[PDB]
Amino acid sequence: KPNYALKFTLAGHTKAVSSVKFSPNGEWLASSSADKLIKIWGAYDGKFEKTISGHKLGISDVAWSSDSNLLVSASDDKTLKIWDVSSGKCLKTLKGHSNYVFCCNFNPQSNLIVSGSFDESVRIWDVKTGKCLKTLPAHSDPVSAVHFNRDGSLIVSSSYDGLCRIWDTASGQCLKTLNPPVSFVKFSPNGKYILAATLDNTLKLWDYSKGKCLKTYTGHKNEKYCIFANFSVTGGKWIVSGSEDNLVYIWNLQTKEIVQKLQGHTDVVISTACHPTENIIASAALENDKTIKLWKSDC
């Protein structure tokens, strides 16, 4: 069992936090918020670094390029923005969605960005030109998550429509459809499994190749929000998620037992992230709290 303990509380957002993500090189945590801002914090000392601004409405997600130099953000202003982290400058505004942009990610090469929107579509964008390469008529309700697999050859998407779909990146064709709203999905680090959250207080681990559910994780509260969940791999092999009872939940991936619940937040824990090399979790909460917490474990 891990022993995550609170190390830092990061204050500065003035509305709900939406998404926190560690840079791939481990140096930084980026946060996005309903306050229209991205903030950058030191991953190991929690020290506030800078605010990145330019969206006209709140931000629901942020993601890093593989070299840790760029961010992309998804906003209620119906755009994504690509940012140079060092300069804080908006390099490109990605225009095309017809409703809020809710989720985003770079591919491993980081030449592409995938987005999902309240407009029910998934879009694939060229980072260099800032132009949309493909629009996938992916779902029949808002798209809650989008994620590339380990080499970027596949995209997984999820939606309030109750479906999780897997797409061939190069062609845009749907390869597989895996019905409560699906509120989050993500490939496992090796690309073989998909972790999927549904709004009936349940997470499930699916075998992509077999299209079969292998594990179910329960005990947390998730009936309303699209809460980020994670595979923790730096120490023990855990599943980590936020929860609507204001706690971070950690489960043993294989046995499905809850191994720790992290207390301290005073609103829904909407986002968790796991550090790429250290046993460090970042968590963030909605507008009664507005803070990010950094936790550390010895395993």
Ligand X SMILES: C[C@H](NC(=O)c1cccc(CNC2=NCCN2)c1)c1cccc(Cl)c1
- Using the contact rule CB under 6 A, the part of the chain among 37-45, 64-72, 179-187, 260-268 near ligand X is 179-187
181-200: which residues touch ligand X (CB under 6 A)? 181, 183-184
Q: Is 61 in the site for ligand X (CB under 6 A)?
A: yes
119-148: which residues touch ligand X (CB under 6 A)? 142, 144-145
Between residues 40 and 226, which has the closer beta carbon with respect to ligand X?
A: 226
| Of 22, 83, 106, 160, the one binding ligand X by CB under 6 A | 160
Q: C-beta of 145: minimal distance to ligand X in Å?
A: 5
Binding mask 248-287 for ligand X (x = CB under 6 A): ----------------------x-----------------
Between residues 116 and 152, which has the closer beta carbon with respect to ligand X?
A: 116
Binding mask 82-121 for ligand X (x = CB under 6 A): --------------------xx------------------
| Of 20, 164, 226, 239, the one binding ligand X by CB under 6 A | 226
Q: What token pair was written down for 258? A: 């809850």
Binding site for ligand X (CB under 6 A): 18-19, 60-61, 102-103, 142, 144-145, 160, 181, 183-184, 225-226, 228, 270
